[PDB]
Amino acid sequence: NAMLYPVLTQSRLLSDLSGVWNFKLDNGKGFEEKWYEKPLKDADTMPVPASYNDLKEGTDFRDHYGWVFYQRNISVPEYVKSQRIVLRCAAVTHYAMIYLNGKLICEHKGGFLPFEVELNDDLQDGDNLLTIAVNNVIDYTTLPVGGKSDKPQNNPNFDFFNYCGITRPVKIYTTPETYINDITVTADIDFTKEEPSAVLNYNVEIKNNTCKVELFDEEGTKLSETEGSEGTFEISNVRLWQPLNAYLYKIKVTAGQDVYTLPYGVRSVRVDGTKFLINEKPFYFKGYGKHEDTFPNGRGINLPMNTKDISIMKWQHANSFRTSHYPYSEEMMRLCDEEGIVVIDETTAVGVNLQFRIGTFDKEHGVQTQEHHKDVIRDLISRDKNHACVVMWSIANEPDSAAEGAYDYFKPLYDLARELDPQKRPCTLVSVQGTTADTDCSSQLSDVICLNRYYGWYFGGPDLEVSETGLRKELSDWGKLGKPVMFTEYGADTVSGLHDTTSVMYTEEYQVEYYEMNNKVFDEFDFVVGEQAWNFADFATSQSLLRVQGNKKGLFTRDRKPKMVAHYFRNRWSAIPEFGYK
Amino acid sequence: NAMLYPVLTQSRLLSDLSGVWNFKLDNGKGFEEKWYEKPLKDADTMPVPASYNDLKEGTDFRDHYGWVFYQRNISVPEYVKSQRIVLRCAAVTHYAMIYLNGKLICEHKGGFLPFEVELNDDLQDGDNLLTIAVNNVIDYTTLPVGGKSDKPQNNPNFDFFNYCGITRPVKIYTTPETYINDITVTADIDFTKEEPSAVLNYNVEIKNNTCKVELFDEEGTKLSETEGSEGTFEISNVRLWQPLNAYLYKIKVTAGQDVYTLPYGVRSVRVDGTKFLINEKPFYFKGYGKHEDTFPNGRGINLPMNTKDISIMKWQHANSFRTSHYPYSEEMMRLCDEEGIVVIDETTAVGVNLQFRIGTFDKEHGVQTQEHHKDVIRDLISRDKNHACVVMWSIANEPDSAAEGAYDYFKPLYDLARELDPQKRPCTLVSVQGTTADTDCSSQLSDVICLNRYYGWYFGGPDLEVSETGLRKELSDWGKLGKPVMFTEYGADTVSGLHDTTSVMYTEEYQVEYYEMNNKVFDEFDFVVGEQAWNFADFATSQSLLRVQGNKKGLFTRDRKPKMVAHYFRNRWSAIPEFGYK
Ligand SMILES: O=C(O)[C@H]1O[C@@H](N2CCN(c3nnnc4c3sc3nc(N5CCOCC5)c5c(c34)CCCC5)CC2)[C@H](O)[C@@H](O)[C@@H]1O
Ligand SMILES: O=C(O)[C@H]1O[C@@H](N2CCN(c3nnnc4c3sc3nc(N5CCOCC5)c5c(c34)CCCC5)CC2)[C@H](O)[C@@H](O)[C@@H]1O
């Protein structure tokens, strides 16, 4: 359906269940022995939320295959049974199974978007046993996609480690028996007037059954009031949320005995040939593709680092960033609203490429994700549709875009995408290397062409000259489409500390020369509408000859320390405006 | 008074207020402009809990002198006013001032122990403005102690950076109008019987006015019941909480409409000449002195790293660790109970040494901390007295133990210490270098002699031979006291990655040779009862010629990566039992 970010409102409530839960690894027999009923014997300690792989020693934990069992003592005073009581799981990666006192109540497939379940009718009073059971297996039926010796081990079709567990927080909140279930505010700005202003349309609806909303500004001064399920809210000379200059209005939808408020930003996003326009102005993407990766948290949420990364980005003179290869935490999404970081939202659709002999979209011996793929496109837009920060959506990362059955697979998702977006924001998919304008189904399905090209590493490296003409060749060909092309990934593995006057691959010097060259070409084409480096920071992958203790293509280290190229970019972007770059 | 760790019990409640609050740095005029009343203009974003210094860029933030203002929207449904409502601040470092809707309600001096205040009578309904204002100034009236150019800047008398802000979590809980305010369980074990068992004494008392408690075990099976304010609870063949083998019983004190439960471990601690005995067995301390230091969290609580450190310690074959130079978070204290980590609790009493010409305890131009020093000795034992993990207390780190007025300053605190400990656990103070048996007031006030000697770095380095005879000389002299001496600090700064076949200072090789030498001597004296290296991991200090980007004496890096010496110790302690080392 739809899901609001639980907060503390007079109407509802909220208690963070996160702490150090009881924990045990599945041995196989664990399910039929019904460990979810009783407590867990010979248990271990495990903080929540955080992916568990890197919080114990030895390969037994890090590379475990199968199920893990979290157990937690839940308990409530009776005067709360008064109200709706809910259990919102912001993200237990992959598959989740919840037992309370010994009975499976909820289940989810997808480890990067929330899901909830109410407890009032099965919530016994006294000591209650909550048992979330997570599984880490990836195959052709999951997004992200896992591929195919002795003993079992997941083989990911993506280039980043497979951190699982309760990645984001577990909490309990409560609402009135008739409660708000979903807001939806849109906007049409009338840049008509030299001094502009506009009006917004709301769309509440509840779940017994009055309903009418109040409007505020940054500091808290009220500016209007109205009624209805789907009315208007005119504003005169409004402050447009802009990149690196966020203004957020707030909304107090008071209805029934329920009150919940919502921060909102007013901004316009629409493409026009080869120009990405926010607030009817020509933008340029300056930033990087990043990851929810820290140590030892794994993919577990780290609010401090979140703010630290945003500071570093502002320090570096950036504005954009694509969401990894999966939806990010809600706290980060909102934080980008307050700080004004234009964000590209991506689905957990990475791995839809078997060209790494059955084809990707072979309908019997191949991918089996279109269905679930559609769910996340629903559950994600259902979650962040009210974020001024989100300027665009990307349905998949590096899929077999130029293979038979590519169109017949994506257009259904594109349609569902641009149909559920209450703002009809642009949609795109970042194509892998080896795609051509005349070859990529994204040339027609997408509004913005976003490439993952690496001319200087995989291609041509270390010959930066032949690599240059290469990118120039492919780049100009993309101009024939007459639409905006932006690089969402270019980079080169470099080990911080390795220096050389005449650079070679993996040195800090080479990384700078690589970005110097590519950027030189990017600046030759007025239809290139933004550069995003891969990656923001070194992150953990799975072991292999081609990974020097994880991925080292980041501009910063895993501990957020700047490599030399981080300064090169801070200088270059220093001399590049958010608007008017042409 | 006393403070329990708030949890989710049928009786009470708990909602974590921690998130990303509104934030502003004080400009001076901020207080008279009364920013606590209104919201905060031109505000910034700052996650809570975490010390704020390292979460923005530029020296303006990191080295700020003075006040910071946190602001947060607090809000509650009326059906809760039913119950006691409380605001527990686990630790806003240094001085804290709380305003609600614009009125200062609570204040605290001390940034490493909790403090609470109830809100029911001034908690307006609707949108409420909470404003915690923190100050970072240190002087001769604070613990830790700050000493004494242009523009103001704190000068710490301790060797670690001055991370401040809301270091530990902010939350709200609720109790019944008559509630439990303090438990107190002691134990006498009758190792009489070849197969032993014992009985425990409880001590509840409330704050209107029945009262009688239930007892359980690991899994949840009940074993007894009784009544009274100060009764007994006999157990037969009980599992003694032991180092690296924790057994924790649980207690359900049901009284009035209030229920709160407590985990407890049964263990015996008593000194006998030159032998530290836990459960009437001769122990040996194997571990390190550590810090609440991570990046970029500052001193902010990091539950994931907590478990990660504990895993590394188990991986390394350790058992002990002294609490830095200040009390640690409650979550960590409890986690050591579950994992069985014997812990030395230390006060924020570091900096009581002005020999770094008025004397330390000069009663007019010198330290002014004895009073506040006594409060923390009260507030800390009031907090962790029920922790089987805590085997000992240390009242101060490296004070001027051998100066006039030393005795007259510490004995009052020692007395208050061993008088409020409901278990009469040993007390000690770690002496600085330059102290002698015949010179240190700790030779009489303390039960265990714990040295901070560094023969091989500050003394003698790099001449490891002369440094050896040096330590041998001072070490044997300490034998004359006929009591247990344990090194709580020995180490040597080394930059991970710097190697050399013939080692020199700051190389990994030297660090190993240093520990090799000192350990060789430690093993010569049957009255040395444990080695703790300084430090567990590299941590942040303030800048100076003698600090290579912080402190680098750790066995691991700041990101928890093992230097070569981390393996040396894992091997040595590998061959050293927790008991019977002599
Ligand atoms: O890898 C990274 O760090 C990041 O890159 C992106 N993805 C790029 C495409 N893909 C690849 N991964 N690994 N190797 C190659 C590709 S494509 C390619 N093409 C190649 N040749 C044709 C193109 O011209 C040059 C020659 C060659 C190689 C590769 C490897 C060495 C031999 C030549 C998956 C990763 C992902 O978005 C990102 O998640 C990942 O983290
Ligand atoms: O410093 C660390 O890393 C850790 O050490 C501990 N503390 C040790 C004592 N103290 C010192 N800090 N810095 N320098 C010296 C001392 S004492 C001393 N004595 C010295 N001479 C007499 C003893 O024989 C050798 C010669 C010399 C020096 C020092 C410095 C260089 C010149 C010779 C405060 C720090 C703290 O518990 C810890 O918090 C800190 O982090």
From TrEMBL, chains A, B:
<dbReference type="InterPro" id="IPR017853">
    <property type="entry name" value="GH"/>
</dbReference>
<feature type="domain" description="Glycoside hydrolase family 2 immunoglobulin-like beta-sandwich">
    <location>
        <begin position="178"/>
        <end position="267"/>
    </location>
</feature>
<comment type="similarity">
    <text>Belongs to the glycosyl hydrolase 2 family.</text>
</comment>
<dbReference type="InterPro" id="IPR008979">
    <property type="entry name" value="Galactose-bd-like_sf"/>
</dbReference>
<keyword id="KW-0378">Hydrolase</keyword>
<dbReference type="InterPro" id="IPR006103">
    <property type="entry name" value="Glyco_hydro_2_cat"/>
</dbReference>
<keyword id="KW-0326">Glycosidase</keyword>
<dbReference type="GO" id="GO:0019391">
    <property type="term" value="P:glucuronoside catabolic process"/>
</dbReference>
<dbReference type="Pfam" id="PF02836">
    <property type="entry name" value="Glyco_hydro_2_C"/>
</dbReference>
<dbReference type="Pfam" id="PF00703">
    <property type="entry name" value="Glyco_hydro_2"/>
</dbReference>
<dbReference type="InterPro" id="IPR023230">
    <property type="entry name" value="Glyco_hydro_2_CS"/>
</dbReference>
<dbReference type="GO" id="GO:0030246">
    <property type="term" value="F:carbohydrate binding"/>
</dbReference>
<protein>
    <recommendedName>
        <fullName>Beta-glucuronidase</fullName>
        <ecNumber>3.2.1.31</ecNumber>
    </recommendedName>
</protein>
<dbReference type="InterPro" id="IPR013783">
    <property type="entry name" value="Ig-like_fold"/>
</dbReference>
<dbReference type="GO" id="GO:0004566">
    <property type="term" value="F:beta-glucuronidase activity"/>
</dbReference>
<dbReference type="InterPro" id="IPR036156">
    <property type="entry name" value="Beta-gal/glucu_dom_sf"/>
</dbReference>
<feature type="domain" description="Glycoside hydrolase family 2 catalytic">
    <location>
        <begin position="269"/>
        <end position="576"/>
    </location>
</feature>
<dbReference type="Pfam" id="PF02837">
    <property type="entry name" value="Glyco_hydro_2_N"/>
</dbReference>
<dbReference type="InterPro" id="IPR006101">
    <property type="entry name" value="Glyco_hydro_2"/>
</dbReference>
<dbReference type="GO" id="GO:0005975">
    <property type="term" value="P:carbohydrate metabolic process"/>
</dbReference>
<dbReference type="InterPro" id="IPR006102">
    <property type="entry name" value="Ig-like_GH2"/>
</dbReference>
<dbReference type="InterPro" id="IPR006104">
    <property type="entry name" value="Glyco_hydro_2_N"/>
</dbReference>
<dbReference type="InterPro" id="IPR023232">
    <property type="entry name" value="Glyco_hydro_2_AS"/>
</dbReference>
<feature type="domain" description="Glycosyl hydrolases family 2 sugar binding">
    <location>
        <begin position="15"/>
        <end position="176"/>
    </location>
</feature>
